[PDB]
Amino acid sequence: MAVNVYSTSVTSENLSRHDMLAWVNDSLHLNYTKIEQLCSGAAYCQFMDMLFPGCVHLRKVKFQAKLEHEYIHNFKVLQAAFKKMGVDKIIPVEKLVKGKFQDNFEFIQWFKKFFDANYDGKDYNPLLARQ
Amino acid sequence: MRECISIHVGQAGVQIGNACWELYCLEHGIQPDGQMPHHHDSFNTFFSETGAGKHVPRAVFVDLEPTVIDEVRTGTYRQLFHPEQLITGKEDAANNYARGHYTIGKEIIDLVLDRIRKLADQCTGLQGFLVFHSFGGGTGSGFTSLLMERLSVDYGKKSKLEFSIYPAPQVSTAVVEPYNSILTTHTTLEHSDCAFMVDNEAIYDICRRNLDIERPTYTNLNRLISQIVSSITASLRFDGALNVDLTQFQTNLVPYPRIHFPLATYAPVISAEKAYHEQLSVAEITNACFEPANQMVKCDPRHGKYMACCLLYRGDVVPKDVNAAIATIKTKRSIQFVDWCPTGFKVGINYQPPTVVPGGDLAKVQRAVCMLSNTTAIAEAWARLDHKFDLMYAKRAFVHWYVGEGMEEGEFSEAREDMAALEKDYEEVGVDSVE
Amino acid sequence: MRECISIHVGQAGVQIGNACWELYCLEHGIQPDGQMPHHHDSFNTFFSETGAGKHVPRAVFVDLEPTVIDEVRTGTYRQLFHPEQLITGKEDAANNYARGHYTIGKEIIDLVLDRIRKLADQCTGLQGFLVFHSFGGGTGSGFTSLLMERLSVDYGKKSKLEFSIYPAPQVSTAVVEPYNSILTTHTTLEHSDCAFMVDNEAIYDICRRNLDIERPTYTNLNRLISQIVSSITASLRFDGALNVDLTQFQTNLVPYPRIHFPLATYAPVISAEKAYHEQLSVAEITNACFEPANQMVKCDPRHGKYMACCLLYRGDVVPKDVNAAIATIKTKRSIQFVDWCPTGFKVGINYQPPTVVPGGDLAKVQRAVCMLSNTTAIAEAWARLDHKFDLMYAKRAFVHWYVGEGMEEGEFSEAREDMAALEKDYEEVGVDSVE
Amino acid sequence: MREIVHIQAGQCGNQIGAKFWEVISDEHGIDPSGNYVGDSDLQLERISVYYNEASSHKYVPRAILVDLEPGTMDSVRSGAFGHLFRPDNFIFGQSGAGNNWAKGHYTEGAELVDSVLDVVRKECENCDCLQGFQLTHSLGGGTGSGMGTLLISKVREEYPDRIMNTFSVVPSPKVSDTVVEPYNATLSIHQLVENTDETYCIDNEALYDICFRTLKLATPTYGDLNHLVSATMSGVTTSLRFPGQLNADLRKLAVNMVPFPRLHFFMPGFAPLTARGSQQYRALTVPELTQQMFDAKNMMAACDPRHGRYLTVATVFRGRMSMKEVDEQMLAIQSKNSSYFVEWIPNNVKVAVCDIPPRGLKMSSTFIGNSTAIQELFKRISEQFTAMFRRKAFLHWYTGEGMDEMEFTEAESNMNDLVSEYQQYQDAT
Amino acid sequence: MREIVHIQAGQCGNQIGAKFWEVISDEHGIDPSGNYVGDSDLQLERISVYYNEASSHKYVPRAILVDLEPGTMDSVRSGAFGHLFRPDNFIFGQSGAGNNWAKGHYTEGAELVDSVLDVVRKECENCDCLQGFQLTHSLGGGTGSGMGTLLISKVREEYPDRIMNTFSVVPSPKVSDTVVEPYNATLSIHQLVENTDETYCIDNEALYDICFRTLKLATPTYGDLNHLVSATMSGVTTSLRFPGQLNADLRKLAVNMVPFPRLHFFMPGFAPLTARGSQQYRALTVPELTQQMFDAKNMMAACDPRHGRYLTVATVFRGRMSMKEVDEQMLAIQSKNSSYFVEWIPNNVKVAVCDIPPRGLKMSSTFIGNSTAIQELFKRISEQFTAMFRRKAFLHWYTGEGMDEMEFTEAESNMNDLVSEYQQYQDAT
Ligand SMILES: Nc1nc2c(ncn2[C@@H]2O[C@H](COP(=O)(O)OP(=O)(O)OP(=O)(O)O)[C@@H](O)[C@H]2O)c(=O)[nH]1
Ligand SMILES: Nc1nc2c(ncn2[C@@H]2O[C@H](COP(=O)(O)OP(=O)(O)OP(=O)(O)O)[C@@H](O)[C@H]2O)c(=O)[nH]1
Ligand SMILES: Nc1nc2c(ncn2[C@@H]2O[C@H](COP(=O)(O)OP(=O)(O)OP(=O)(O)O)[C@@H](O)[C@H]2O)c(=O)[nH]1
Ligand SMILES: Nc1nc2c(ncn2[C@@H]2O[C@H](COP(=O)(O)OP(=O)(O)OP(=O)(O)O)[C@@H](O)[C@H]2O)c(=O)[nH]1
Ligand SMILES: [Mg+2]
Ligand SMILES: [Mg+2]
Ligand SMILES: [Mg+2]
Ligand SMILES: [Mg+2]
Structure with missing residues (x-):
């Protein structure tokens, strides 16, 4: 089981756009330059693996997705991981895949709050996990 | 030019067939007396046309108890059916599979086969058989197994679709239902190309909720099932922008030899009052037909993973919005497919809007959808039936009746082991595996 | 192209909603049945146009007791609403916050969310939800706190405007009003973008003095409140020289996340006979709307300082005299602003003169003003309510009803300190700061 | 088609049988003279099952009445509704068995049984496709039990592959009508168990309690007592006599109700049962029929089921109804009363519905329950x-x-x- | 929807109940024979709350009349308006309790409760969604207090999450109707406080004072007294029976009126009360209706509020009235009469408004006050x-x-x- 958190209007808690990208890059040791590049969902699937060991078959996802049809399959795995841990946030997959700033920024804003709630401070090397 | 024949076995089969043939006569514009006042031929596929203007259906009503067949004979559709086709016995099977398959059913099987053979030789482009039968009923189950064996022996490879009635998890009318259902599943698991599965409790709930009727007698359930059957056959009966056939259904829906138990759903099922305040768009009718509570078998597909889906739209349907809605549905969160079926939708479109029977509960609609889903959630129903059978058989109840009517306990043991093997195969195929 | 849905909860919401939706049909020329005899669309933002010429509103009427919803069903607006939208329970919350939020409300919350999602997915450019709920009631407070928690999770960042009904200072229909109001504000504080405050006591005086009516039943008050609601969304449905949207209201009135409690005001409000002897210029209705006696909440703005305002004219209004009139208002010494808000006015002009419902008290007017002042003077209302709650809770009166229905004594203390946090938050920023 | 042969033995069988054929004739609209006077053609669709066609549209029944004394026979012949039975079937002896087993099964019954079997064989050969036999007797008297057992053994030999029902009358617990009750009953039941298919055990004083309290009758004579037995004894048959939405017959009921060959002793029931005065304040509907049927008070046997468990139960509804509630309420009844239901027989309820209501009633039912309380x-x-x-x-x-x-x-x-x-x-x- | 089960015990409960169902039938336009004869369709919108629909559109009340002697039952059955009750509900004993606690709670009441409980359960099962029970009895007599308490305890054990109201007739101070009054009263209240929800104490001589002085009646029989009580016991539940601007029900009253579990003893009131002669010189308006309610002279309990303080006060108006005067004057009453109001409960008034006036009046009201003078x-x-x-x-x-x-x-x-x-x-x- 996992704990949930909502996000409607909070002050002094939302982070800047520049800082959000630094946190994603620092946690997984990669070179995302734009936040809108997070349309792939490869980083999103890795986040669930870090939060809860197992619960996601990381072999199913692929990090070399470049097409519209390829983007969706990555999110379908994340859909099953959300159900298994019992979270109840509906991913608007029809809107993230277009790779626009609006929808991609709101989802990571919610995911940052979810990350802090279910983090026990464990650390590992994603490089060996990715390969 | 293409002909498929229908065999209705038992009281449930006969009543469902009565409703279905009323619907067909309404659809093709045939008067009850057989005369008449896309369409031209159409009725040639079902109604054989005799010397005069009269049309006679290609139906074979068979039963052992004569009450319901006499009721049909004296019913309003008396001049339509060929009197030789209606085959009746003298005493019923009395919910005894042994009696309906071994003792009694062997005394009329030859006549039934003779009538089937005459009807088949009458036609020239025979396509398949449609068998309307229940599962709990003794005569239904026994004669269905006997007919499957005989037809498979006679005609080698033809489509043989069935429209069964699965016993409800809680609602029950008989007591030997587990024995009958287990036996029939073990016997006819091998001789069936594709069996569509329908439960009475789910149809009760659908009629109560969506259509909002508090007095849903068996007529309404029969009408709904008849609508589903007509939607399946409309591709053969009528032209369309993208046609499908019985072989297409069979090929696209059965991935493995044992896993051929899909479940059906129809949409939209709304009353007359609620019709005006609804817009009835292709996307929303797809969503409603794919909604979990609209499924006509008492099982939630959310508990399992889909394996194959067949959508059939009929009416004023545009393939662009059809394909847009299907893409949205695939993107949705509730639908989760198996890893080895990257493509999981077969789509058919028909140009004939559905017709409405007079006095019926449903309202006129310009768009209709029939959904046939082969999934994994049926494993829970198989397991529940197996548990009921095991609980009853642990101390040999009614086995004295079954053995006295020419059977042995070895048959029960073999049926049990076959059902266990089928459940194990279903679960193993549905579950994911590495590499 | 722009859609916003409205949820009416409790008797207060339904009774207000019955009067409000009567106004929209008049504005867009929609007959009560649904047919019809700036306009090209207009009604698409509220009325979803179905297959025929009929239009059905985008409303969700939810209540626990079936007494008042049934009145709407049998009322003159019987054919308008979608029959599925009118959701009813079995027994009311009985002025108990715990019953309408923990025990009874939970059994119907899932059904309501089902209809919300069906209407939201039908629309394409959804902006926000309009919630018409009271404060003193059980289902209008306990249940409406459940909807905010559920709605916010499903839709992340959307506008959520509440048109509440503050309990009056002296007039009091119920006796556990302090218990219900204190609990609701602490729960829905974090899930409301902008809540408009309206008090029944202040409207009685406005109808008695300005309108000169000595028989102000609840029908008369709801007509006057409904005009405020229409002017808020009058810019979406009609063109104008300077348009505003639902988001612009939210960004211009809320300096801090906790401080989002403005109070409405309408002008002009005159009877039929007094209308002729008044010239009704733009420079005076702006003055009229700023008088301390015309404010719709029983609190004098003279005791506090304004933080932000929002004017909304409509009709034969020319922007030159609008800006001239506001300049004279600013230099008047009765109106005083806060230091850290050098700019304190937002304007919006529309070309649609307000319409009048037949039999209404208000006369035909070519100009109208709706004022949304976010002022510090509302801090007095919080202090008065907190005084009542602290008085009765010290000896633990009426608590045994709340505790026994799925609550804890500890939960009361958390809601008490939260209102104390808001009370000094409201003052510490309205008061000046050094440097 | 599926004709049923009726055999009546003893004084109780004749008195019950005489009241029974009053109901059947009323159901099919047969005049006491023996000619059809009905209106609807549905009644004549299946008339051969009980009645027998004869010349000039006569409908003499397929009944055989046998007794050792002419006291009972003379009453049915001289009384009303006695002009339609065939006088050939009126077999009677000379002297009564005297409440004795041997005098009804060995000595005095020896000569009478040979004559009866010839009449039974003649009736059976006239049949098109025999379905089974029906026998009504008493387990306490001599003639009703001495030969009824003898008839059962002889008929069973001739037609082993048939289903026959025995609507016996179990002796009363409180007051015994005959002094030597146990000797006649015990020697009889040991014979019924061997060669019978299902017996509908009913009790006398259990009907006294039902008629006095529920029916609110101050003076229950045997005419009103036997009337109650007739209704429950014709409900079980009416499924095959009339068209229905879920048919049943004698064989279908036996398969469900008899898990084991020895365990075939049932407890009948009937509903609704209302006084003449109190019928105007009840809404005749399915929810109240099932409640009246399943309570231990409205049971026609001197046995309270609360001390036992229902092995299997079947309810044969009548009249016109919607089968959403017919099977919705039995699920509710089963779940609430799951304590008195066996655990190794899942979904132990059989339900059948006809389409012709009984005379003077919108809807009714008949409840047959195989319980452990026996x-x-x-x-x-x-x-x-x-x-x-x-x-x-x-x-x-x-x-x-x-x-x-x-x-x-x-x-x-x-x-x-x-x-x-x-x-x-x-x-x- | 939200049906209410009505239970009457003792002679007073039957006599009060007999006059009560006269008012309800008049309100809903129900003929004494039991068939609807009304004109406005609003009455039939909520008819299942009190009455029960039966066959042929005949309506039967949901009442259970029980008494230990046949004296009261015989009067109501043979008299007028006795053709509509269900005869099954007419439960009675044979010998009276003799104005004894034990004879009505242990010895003679033991047999009756087993039979009564089955009728209550049968009535509750027929209900769609139960709201609560209503009991009218006496705190001084034997059967009214003896069995009434036993009925309260047995029902409370089966339906714990339900709200029920007891309209007891409290004993009178100056004149005692029965010699051993305190033994029955004290032994009853100790039981009511434990397992009852909300109780309206109604006195006897306080009704004499109201009828003699306010109504100006020289010879008030028991028909005139029971008529006065019935208006209050109908005004409480009239909010959920008819549409209103500000609705209320049984549960809403209990939450507001009962600050603590043990403090649930109320005092009722009614207005207006005018004689036939003096009705023409007063204009029916809200200013005088509220004035007639709060004065100590017009109260149904012989306890002057001036010696105590009002904890909380309700007011259930009826008819058509402007909502301003409803809220305007109650504030004026509170400020002027602030001496007799509790200080730690601010705004201690609860008000509800209906929209259907009582028969033969433009508007009326009902005042329920939980005071300290009790x-x-x-x-x-x-x-x-x-x-x-x-x-x-x-x-x-x-x-x-x-x-x-x-x-x-x-x-x-x-x-x-x-x-x-x-x-x-x-x-x-
Ligand atoms: N959907 C549907 N099912 C029916 C209908 N009529 C009967 N059934 C099913 O049929 C089952 C009863 O067994 P049947 O197949 O009718 O057997 P039968 O025709 O009576 O013949 P026997 O087996 O010898 O008794 C019940 O469990 C029902 O579920 C019907 O009209 N519609
Ligand atoms: N402005 C306005 N307020 C109303 C109206 N009707 C009721 N109210 C308010 O509603 C409050 C009554 O409680 P409600 O919110 O209606 O509670 P409810 O809807 O009856 O549901 P419950 O609390 O369970 O009884 C009163 O204090 C009034 O202030 C109305 O017609 N107009
Ligand atoms: N249902 C019903 N049962 C009866 C009636 N009259 C008698 N009985 C029962 O049937 C039994 C009658 O005895 P029978 O078996 O007929 O014996 P019999 O006719 O007197 O002839 P013998 O045995 O030689 O004395 C009694 O024990 C009663 O319990 C009746 O009118 N109705
Ligand atoms: N309001 C009202 N009260 C009455 C009326 N008649 C009697 N009472 C009161 O009710 C009490 C009657 O005693 P019950 O409780 O009915 O006792 P009972 O019915 O006589 O039976 P026993 O207790 O065995 O004597 C008396 O003490 C009266 O005070 C009446 O007509 N109207
Ligand atoms: Mg059958
Ligand atoms: Mg309410
Ligand atoms: Mg005799
Ligand atoms: Mg008495």
């Missing part, structure tokens, strides 16, 4: 028999009419054996 | 009981039917405990 009924009878037999009382002429003490040894042992299995399955897990 | 009623009863118990008078009649002197120790101790809390809260700051 265990105590045989325990009480065996208890009385054991005490009487130990002292060697009243058998100085049972042995004197052919029988012997050796015969009693198996009869008591079989009865005690049967109640051991009946009780054992109640506690089985 | 304390003086319990002090008087406890004082009488303590003095009588000290001499051990009449006690050897209660001990002979099961009870003992040990049971009395808590009954008097509980009553003294309850009046201690009632006093302490009046003076609490």
